[PDB]
């Protein structure tokens, strides 16, 4: 007979959280940034187009040197391109034809891929004996893999589709910490610049901030009206942006516990498939389901421009560490570099 | 120097491109099929003829390689991973015969999904013997769970069932018409449905899939030439 008491306590705690959020809010971001010069119209052209994939590209990850990038497509191939010369350095034929994500190690020695097999495969690239094979096959997830990120050469964080995120440990094959609390499939995750926290956007229209060292959720951010398909930490590390299926992008804050700004246009209704930030954190390049990416001014919520060069919907995009170029991958098996 | 590195990179790229072409020559010669359906629909019996998340079943007929994927091992929620199966030649659907209403709503959601509009579905009305026994015993009824069987009339256009009683044919074609009404209620001529009455021990199912894939590819080729 404690169900009513538990529900009442939960409602009271939610009301207290709402009151605390209201108290800490005094002026919106729109009324505090209306004194700066607008960026103006911006335009970037496709400097390079990378061809060779046979199926739709679902993920891509730039290297830490802004020279090499990996791309995963549904034809069971992992191609490691050379951005400068449009050369295919490697081509790894995966044993699974339904890879949904890919990752590049910060040191560049290993790569990762996961999909509809609940297994994260680590491929060793630094070995040079005529063979490039899978080193470790991480198994233990129940739902499909959605996004994997490397913390170190021996640690990788994976976000499965069974409402659970896990911190793995290569060279052993077993997990270290399991993150629980989501009620929907986790679609994306992004590591903090200092590699201590990471957010995860799930299909419950909520994002949770996790502590890697401990393994408990710190804050939960709400406000989106549909499933969150992408997420990306702000370069400062104290904020992040969420791309949901309600055709709105929202920028949350890690210190105010509430949303800051929304990026919506009445003339477009399409879910956001990928979200990334520039080097300075001023532009929000978010891809859409209407076959092009839109560049958003984070400070003013005004569209700076649109990158329309893809035949099909963009499923992945990422700006390099140095901010020189942004690469977007669509479902037409074409990888393009924009500068 | 830059010259040696460039030459080595060009050689490696040429070798990798040759490998990519070789793999493309065999990737386009295989058709991918997604085997989907509600639980206890008898699809596991077809699978076993030949835990993870995707089961691969490689079978061939008339020199043509087919790649059928079973999605067992995933969670119930499927609005996200179903978008990956948009390049499949067909989506095999198995329906057990309110267990039928759930399958009807699932097929409806599949039909008008914006990313599944191009793909066509093959419909397998499994467990015909169970339906015949249920409708002959009289313990349960379908009129109470579907207030359309009372006014429903048998379609005189097609009823090639020699040994079947009128009632079992009425039930079978009523289920088929219920699926077809949803299929053709909002179609745009881009995808079609292929109902099939199959039992749990039918060895023709692979031939049915082969013929339906042939028809799908023929219609796609006709569309690309703007004839249809």
């Amino acid at each position, epitope marked *: 007979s404690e169900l009513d008491q538990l529900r009442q306590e939960a409602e009271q705690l939610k009301n207290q959280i709402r009151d605390a959020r209201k108290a800490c809010a005094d002026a919106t971001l729109s009324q505090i940034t209306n004194n700066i010069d607008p960026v103006g119209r911006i335009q970037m052209r496709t400097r390079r187009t990378l061809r060779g994939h046979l199926a739709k590209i679902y993920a891509m990850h730039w290297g830490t040197d802004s020279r090499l990038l990996v791309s995963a497509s549904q034809d069971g191939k992992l191609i490691i391109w050379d951005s400068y010369t449009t050369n295919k350095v490697h081509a790894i034929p995966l044993r699974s034809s339904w890879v949904m994500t890919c990752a590049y190690a910060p040191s560049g020695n290993y790569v990762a891929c996961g999909g509809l097999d609940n297994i994260c495969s680590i491929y060793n690239l630094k070995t040079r004996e005529g063979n490039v094979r899978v080193s470790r096959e991480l198994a233990g997830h129940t739902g499909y893999l959605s996004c994997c990120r490397f913390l170190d050469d021996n640690q990788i964080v994976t976000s499965s589709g069974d409402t659970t995120c896990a911190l793995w440990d290569i060279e052993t094959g077993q997990q270290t910490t399991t993150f629980t609390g989501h009620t929907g499939d986790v679609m994306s995750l992004s590591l903090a610049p200092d590699t201590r926290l990471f957010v995860s956007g799930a299909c419950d229209a909520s994002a949770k901030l996790w502590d890697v060292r401990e393994g408990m959720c710190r804050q939960t951010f709400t406000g989106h009206e549909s499933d969150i398909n992408a997420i990306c930490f702000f370069p400062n590390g104290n904020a992040f942006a969420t791309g949901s*299926d309600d055709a709105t992008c929202r920028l949350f804050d890690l210190r105010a516990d509430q949303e800051l700004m929304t990026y919506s246009h009445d003339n477009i209704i399409c879910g956001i498939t990928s979200v990334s930030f520039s080097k300075s954190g001023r532009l929000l390049l978010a891809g859409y389901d209407d076959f092009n990416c839109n560049v958003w001014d984070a400070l003013k919520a005004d569209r700076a421009g649109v990158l329309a060069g893809h035949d099909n919907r963009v499923s992945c995009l990422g700006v390099t560490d140095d901010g020189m170029a942004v690469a977007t991958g669509s479902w037409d098996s074409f990888l393009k570099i924009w500068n | 120097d830059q010259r040696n590195e460039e030459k080595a990179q060009r050689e490696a790229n040429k070798k990798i491109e040759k490998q990519l072409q070789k793999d493309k020559q065999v990737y386009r010669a295989t058709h991918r099929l997604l085997l989907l359906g509600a639980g206890e629909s008898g699809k596991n019996t077809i699978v076993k003829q030949m835990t993870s998340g995707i089961f691969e079943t490689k079978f061939q007929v008339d020199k043509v390689n087919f790649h059928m994927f079973d999605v067992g091992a995933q969670r119930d929620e499927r*609005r996200k991973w179903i978008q990956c199966f948009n390049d499949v030649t067909a989506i095999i659907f198995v329906v057990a015969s*309110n267990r039928l209403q759930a399958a009807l709503k699932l097929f409806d959601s599949i039909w008008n999904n914006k990313w599944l509009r191009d793909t066509s579905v093959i419909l397998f009305l499994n467990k015909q013997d169970l339906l015949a026994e249920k409708v002959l015993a009289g313990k349960s009824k379908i009129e109470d769970y579907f*207030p359309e069987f009372a006014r429903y009339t048998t379609p005189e256009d097609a009823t090639p069932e020699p040994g079947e009683d009128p009632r079992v044919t009425r039930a079978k074609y009523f289920i088929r018409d219920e699926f077809l009404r949803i299929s053709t209620a909002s179609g745009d001529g881009r995808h079609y449905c292929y109902p099939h009455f199959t039992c749990s021990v039918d060895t023709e199912n692979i031939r049915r899939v082969f013929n339906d894939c042939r028809d799908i590819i023929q219609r796609m080729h006709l569309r690309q030439y703007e004839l249809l």
Partner: nanobody
């Protein structure tokens, strides 16, 4: 945050009339589809009825077809299911299901065991 709060439901005689109003909040009402789901004891979740956006297409399941009458009040952020002539087989916990994506008719995963946007629900039972 999406919070669908229901109303109504109590011990009534068979053949009676009930009303279940769902108080939608946290999202734009006239952008999503809505469904009705019930969970009979000892049985799985089942789909009762659905109403398209702006009340264009109304459809019911076979059991309740021709009996209930849904209504979407977009301005007041509420959705009804006017029960009438109840039967001892309609005793189940009813929930309002928000449809996963806006401006889309595919509307997947409504009757899943764990659905994030589904409302809390109220217990509806009939007996004497």
């Amino acid at each position: 945050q999406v919070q669908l709060q229901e109303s109504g439901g109590g011990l009534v005689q068979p053949g009676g009339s009930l009303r279940l109003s769902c108080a939608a909040s946290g999202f734009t009402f006239s952008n999503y589809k809505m469904n009705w789901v019930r969970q009979a004891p000892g049985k799985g979740l089942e789909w009762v009825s659905d109403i398209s956006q702006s009340g264009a297409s109304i459809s019911y399941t076979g059991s309740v077809k021709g009996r209930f009458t849904i209504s979407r009040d977009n301005a007041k952020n509420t959705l009804y299911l006017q029960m009438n002539s109840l039967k001892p087989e309609d005793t189940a916990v009813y929930y309002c299901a928000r449809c996963p994506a806006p401006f889309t008719r595919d509307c997947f995963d409504v009757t899943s065991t764990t659905y994030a946007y589904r409302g809390q629900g109220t217990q509806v039972t009939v007996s004497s």
